[PDB]
């Protein structure tokens, strides 16, 4: 274990970063920050605290924990909070890719 932004081991401190965060977006600062993010200050760009994985362009349906497992599959942060099983089912859907054919 070795955080990418050790000053964030505290979510409360990640909460503090979402002010310029367009409140209009479906993704609330409580969720994002909780999912290990923090707003970088521009647009809707938030980074992870324990893998520093960057994520922009968010849609009404995009869920923080969710997206944080789909593109940043290797985060020691997500893999420790929500577990591997959670990360699996996130990826294993695609259950739709074998239905489309």
């Amino acid at each position: 274990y070795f955080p990418q932004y050790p000053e964030y081991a505290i979510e409360t401190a990640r909460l503090r970063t979402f002010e310029a965060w367009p409140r209009n977006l479906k993704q609330k600062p409580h969720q994002l920050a909780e999912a290990g993010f923090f707003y970088t200050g521009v647009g809707d760009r938030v980074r992870c605290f324990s893998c520093g994985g960057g994520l922009m362009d968010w849609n009404d349906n995009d869920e923080p924990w969710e997206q944080h497992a789909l593109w940043l599959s290797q985060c020691r942060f997500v893999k420790l909070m929500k577990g591997q099983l959670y990360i699996d089912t996130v990826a294993a859907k695609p259950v739709l890719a074998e239905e489309k054919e």
């Binding site: 760009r45 362009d57 849609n59």
Partner: peptide, 7 residues
């Protein structure tokens, strides 16, 4: 430092 878009 790039951004790994979600959508």
């Amino acid at each position: 430092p790039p951004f790994i878009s979600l959508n």
